Amino acid sequence: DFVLSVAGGFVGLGNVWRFPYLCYKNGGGAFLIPYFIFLFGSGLPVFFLEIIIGQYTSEGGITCWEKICPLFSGIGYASVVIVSLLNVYYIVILAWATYYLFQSFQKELPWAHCNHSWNTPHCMEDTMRKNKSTNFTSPVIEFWERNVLSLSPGIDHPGSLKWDLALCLLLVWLVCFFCIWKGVRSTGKVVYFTATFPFAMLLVLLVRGLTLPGAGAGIKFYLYPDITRLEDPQVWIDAGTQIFFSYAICLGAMTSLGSYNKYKYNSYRDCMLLGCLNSGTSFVSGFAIFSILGFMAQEQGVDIADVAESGPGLAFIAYPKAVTMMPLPTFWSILFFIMLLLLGLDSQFVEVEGQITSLVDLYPSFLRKGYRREIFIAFVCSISYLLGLTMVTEGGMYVFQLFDYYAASGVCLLWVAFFECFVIAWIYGGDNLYDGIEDMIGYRPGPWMKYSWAVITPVLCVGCFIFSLVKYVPLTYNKTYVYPNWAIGLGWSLALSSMLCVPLVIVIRLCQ
């Protein structure tokens, strides 16, 4: 059962969706070096740490933190907050994918050309800019902004709700609802179809994506860094949080994976073999999308920095462009739109039940297996559905960025990641942990992650935090929109809701 969730909750759309966006927004290749140092310094170390603690305790995420130390036990509650706030917009990511999929059930793709009612008259076809109001946009960009989101001018103007997204969001929630209620495994039928279908097509996208004439500009922008961007701290926090995002760590779902693994079982190899591949697929997917970005870069005459839209949903623009350029677009458009669900639902299936199994034992005597649990699954889905309706609003894209940058990223993941390595290294003792691991996997793991949990990762988490404090640059959308002061406070309160889980519990735990 553990292997199934590895292909499920462990694998996330952020590898193919957020990773190219996070790299794109933070310059180009200047993202890669912080990505790699954060990976090799904390990511794989803390990944093996949380897997091994879940295996050693053979219990849940919340209970393991208490067992290691009665103090600092709020990491589990923070993880529950993070997974809920992650689900509430991951589900609307899948809703956007499904709405796109339904729109692709046509002879001609809607974003192939912009001659429809919704498209702005200033829209202009992609190919003819060079064959022949200087600001000219692209049909695919417009489709995502208006037909899909109908983005409002500002967050202070919500606007009318888009019923088309709501029904699509209704479908994905029900799909997640029935499988969990019926006890359906994350991978339907044969795991191979849920596994080889993603890997094959990312290669398919990679093959033509690299074949595109503009791939040379994209790869150079993807790989070559800028030292100037390294000074500005937001590239560091984004690179780190991508590590805590793609590997779905500091969520507590992977802790259940450890309990699933046998107490006497070598999980060390499984951590790094899957961890390196997860970065490899993310890196490989970077080549395809950035080549597509490079392909559109030379051919609109616009720089690579502003050729794309610097908002979440980049994977909803680049690859849909590629499939239109790829022969027989309708067949390829559906398949890529299918797997986006196949990459997301399994992630959703594992992670959503992650807190469900975390909450059933958290509040016993009322969540018994049977009548009480079925309403709870409906209860948790319904309350999250209503919270998910904020993004269905025309102005909900601005709300969407708030969760993405604050609820399950930014300082939120750095703070919890610090306290995860802090408790083991100093309070529990890294040597005490390794003493079990020698008896668990059969041999001593390398001291390198012990030092990583000791100084490297604590400095990596702490260093970016103060760098953000002194060099506080407010978050922006599409590098052109500034949120109001109250909007930032709403996003921070979400982080502070995850922040105060730990500091309050010690105050809570000391009183009795």
Q: Smaller CB distance to ligand CLR: residue 219 or 237?
A: 219
With CB cut-offs between 5 and 8 Å by kind, which of ligand CLR, its own copies, none does residue 78 bind?
none
Q: For residue 225, report the phi and psi dihedrals to the nearest 5 degrees.
A: -95, 175
Q: Is 225 near ligand CLR (CB under 6 A)? A: no
Residues 268-327 that bind ligand CLR (CB under 6 A): 283, 326-327
Shortest distance in whole angstroms from residue 219 CB to its own copies: 6
With CB cut-offs between 5 and 8 Å by kind, which of its own copies, ligand CLR, none does residue 210 bind?
its own copies
DSSP-derived 3-state class of residue 123: strand
Shortest distance in whole angstroms from residue 152 CB to its own copies: 40
With CB cut-offs between 5 and 8 Å by kind, which of ligand CLR, its own copies, none does residue 455 bind?
none
Q: Smaller CB distance to its own copies: residue 77 or 222?
A: 222
Structure tokens at 169: 């969001």
**How far apart are the C-alpha atoms of 20 and 126, rounded to whole Å?**
22
Structure tokens at 324: 């239109």
> Where in 57-102 does DSSP place strands (E)?
none
Residue appearing with tokens 């600092």: 72
Distance from the Cα of residue 176 to its chain's centroid:
18
Cβ(444)–Cβ(437) below 8 Å: yes
Shortest distance in whole angstroms from residue 225 CB to ligand CLR: 12
Q: Is 207 near ligand CLR (CB under 6 A)? A: yes
Site string for its own copies, 217-236 (x = CB under 8 A): --x-----------------
From the list 58, 160, 196, 211, which residue makes contact with ligand CLR (rule: CB under 6 A)? Answer: 211
Q: Is 204 near ligand CLR (CB under 6 A)? A: yes
With CB cut-offs between 5 and 8 Å by kind, which of ligand CLR, its own copies, none does residue 348 bind?
none
Cβ(352)–Cβ(87) below 8 Å: yes
Residues 459-488 that bind ligand CLR (CB under 6 A): none
Task: Say how many CA atoms lie within 13 Å of 85 toward its Cβ.
Answer: 29
Q: Is 203 near ligand CLR (CB under 6 A)? A: yes
Q: Which residues of 457-478 are buried (b: 16+ CB within 10 A; e: fewer)?
A: bbebbeebeebbeeeeeebebe
- Beta partners for residue 477, in sequence order: 481
Distance from the Cα of residue 432 to its chain's centroid:
33
Q: Is 219 near ligand CLR (CB under 6 A)? A: yes
Structure tokens at 151: 């983005």
With CB cut-offs between 5 and 8 Å by kind, which of its own copies, ligand CLR, none does residue 213 bind?
its own copies
Site string for its own copies, 176-215 (x = CB under 8 A): ---------------------------x--xx--xx-x-x
Q: Is 287 near its own copies (CB under 8 A)? A: yes
Q: Who contacts 470 (Cβ-Cβ below 8 Å, separation ≥6)?
A: none
- For the chain, what's the residue count? 512
From the list 69, 174, 184, 223, which residue makes contact with ligand CLR (rule: CB under 6 A)? Answer: 223
* Long-range contact pairs involving 278-281 (C-beta distance under 8 Å, separation at least 24): 278/10, 278/11, 278/15, 278/246, 278/247, 279/39, 279/43, 279/246, 281/15, 281/16, 281/199, 281/202
With CB cut-offs between 5 and 8 Å by kind, which of ligand CLR, its own copies, none does residue 223 bind?
ligand CLR
With CB cut-offs between 5 and 8 Å by kind, which of its own copies, ligand CLR, none does residue 496 bind?
none
CB-CB neighbours of 211 under 10 Å = 12
With CB cut-offs between 5 and 8 Å by kind, which of ligand CLR, its own copies, none does residue 204 bind?
ligand CLR
Question: Which residues in this chain contact ligand CLR in the complex, by CB under 6 A?
Answer: 200, 203-204, 207-208, 211, 216, 219-220, 223, 283, 326-327
Question: Which residues in this chain contact its own copies in the complex, by CB under 8 A?
Answer: 203, 206-207, 210-211, 213, 215-216, 219, 284, 287, 291
